[model samples]
Target: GGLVAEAFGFKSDPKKSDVKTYFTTVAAKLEKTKTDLNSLPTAVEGAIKEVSELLDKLVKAVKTAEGASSGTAAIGEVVADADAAKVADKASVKGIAKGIKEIVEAAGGSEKLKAVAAAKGENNKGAGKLFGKAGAAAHGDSEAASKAAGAVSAVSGEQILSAIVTAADAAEQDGKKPEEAKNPIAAAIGDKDGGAEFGQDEMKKDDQIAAAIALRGMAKDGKFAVKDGEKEKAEGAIKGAAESAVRKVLGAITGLIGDAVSSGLRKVGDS
Candidate 1:
C-alpha cells in the first residue's frame, strides 16, 4: 500500500521514482497471484516461482542500496550485495555495469557524472561543466544533489512493460497447454530460456510495444487453445514474474550507477 519510498525516503522527484512505483505495482500484481498459487495451472505456477525469486532480488537490492558507500565501487558494492543477498551473480554485475557506463558515455560521459557528483558537494564544478566554465561556485544543499541523482538510477515503466510482454510471448511458445507450460522467463535467466540470449535492455521500446500488441491479438483470437480463462491466467503469472526479473536486473544496475560517484571517491582514496 504505502510506496517503497514512504519507507525508504528516496522521495526525490515524481519522475525519478517511477520505476520504484512500477515495482510496487507489479509486486502487488504478483501478490495477487500468490493468493491462488495452488489453484494456478502448472505453467503459471512455475513462472511465478521464478518471478518470486526475482522480485525478492529487487526488494533485496533496494534494501542493499539503502545501505552507496559509485561507478566501480558501485559495481563492487553491487557484487558484494549480490553475494550477500545471493540475488545476482558477478558476471551479470560486470555486464550490467559495463552497460551503465556506456549509457553514461552516450549521454555525455564524465560531464554528467561529475555534474551530478558535484551537485552533492557545495562546490559547483558540475555547474561549470554545464556552462563551459572551468569550474565555479555551487550553492545547492546535499539533499538536492542526492534527489537529482536518485532519478538517474531508477527504472522506467516502459522497460518493465516490454519485458512483461516478452515473458508472456515466451511462455506461450514453450507451453504445450496453459496448464503444462514451463516457465520460459525463468529458463532465460538460467541460460535455458532458449531462442536468443540477449539483455533486457536490448529489448527496444518500440519493438516491445509492437510485440505486446501482437500477444494481445493472439489471446483475442483464441489462438491459445486453452479452455476459457486458463491461458489468460497462466499468462498473467508469466508476465508478472517476468516483470520481476526485468525489474530486478534494472534495479540492481541503476543502484550501482547511482553510487558511481561515491564508488569513484572510495576507489580514489584506496589507490
Candidate 2:
C-alpha cells in the first residue's frame, strides 16, 4: 500500500482521472525517451533505465493497491486513457517519414551502414536532434500503413546491430564510403523495385519510410557493446527463420514513432 500511495497518494480508492494523469505522465516519459534514444550520443542505456524505473513505479502502484481487483482495474483504466491519447500528429508523422529518407540517403540504403554511421556519430556530444520538423504531410491512415505497421515488428537491438564489427570490416575492405551503396530500405521507400522485393508496398510508402527511420533510429541509438554478448542468442533466435527476423525489427520502434498507443501501456506492464 505504501507503493500505491507513492504513486497516487493515500486515497481510499483510485480515481479514474488520477489514473489518466499518471498514465499521461508515463506517456510523456516514453516520448522523451524516444527522442533521446534517436539523438546522437544515443541514450539507449539511460532511456531503458528510465523506462524500467517508470515500470517499477507502476508496478508499485499496482501491487500496493488495496486489493487485486482495484489494482487490475487501475491498470485497465490507464490502458484506456493511453489509447485515447494521440501519439503522433500529421506534422510529426511527416517529420519522421522525412527523417527516414535522410537516414536512408546518408546510410546509403544499408541498415548496417546506417547503424555504423550512427554508432560512429554516437560520440558527437554537441550534435542536435537527428530528424527535425521538416517534411511533407503524413499520409492518411490506410491499409498500407496497417500492413507496414506489422512489417516492421520484432527487430531486436542485436538484429539491427547484427554484424556490427563484421560489417564495418566489410565496409573498410571495400575502401568506399558506405553512403555509396544502395539496398532494400532506401529502394523500397523510394518506390524502386527493391522495395517490392522486400514486400514493402504492403504498407503505404509514408509508413514504410517511417519504419526505416524507426529502424535506423533504434539501430543508431542502440548500445553496441552490451548487445555484443546477446549477439549469439539473437542469431540463434533468427536462425532458419529469416522472415521472422526481418519482421521482428520494426514494430516496437514503429509504434514509438507513430501511434504510441500500445507502447506506453506495454511499458507500464513490462515489469
How well does each candidate superpose onto the true structure, as a TM-score? 0.23, 0.20
Question: In the order shown, what is each candidate's alpha-carbon RMSD?
Answer: 24.6, 20.1
Indicate the residue-level lDDT of 83 in model 2: 19
lDDT of 1 by residue, 114-134 (tens): 212211221211110100101
Find the candidate with the highest TM-score and give its number.
1
Please write out the lDDT profile of model 2 over residues 1-271, one tens digit for every residue: 5586354432333332333343344445545655554453434555455554544443333222111111112211111111121211222222222333332222223343234332211121100111111112212112222233333332342333232212222222211111221322331112201111122122222222223323222221110000222223232221112222223322222322233324543443454
Cα lDDT, all candidates: 0.27, 0.27
- Residue 36, candidate 2: C-alpha displacement in angstroms: 25
C-alpha lDDT of residue 33 in model 2: 57
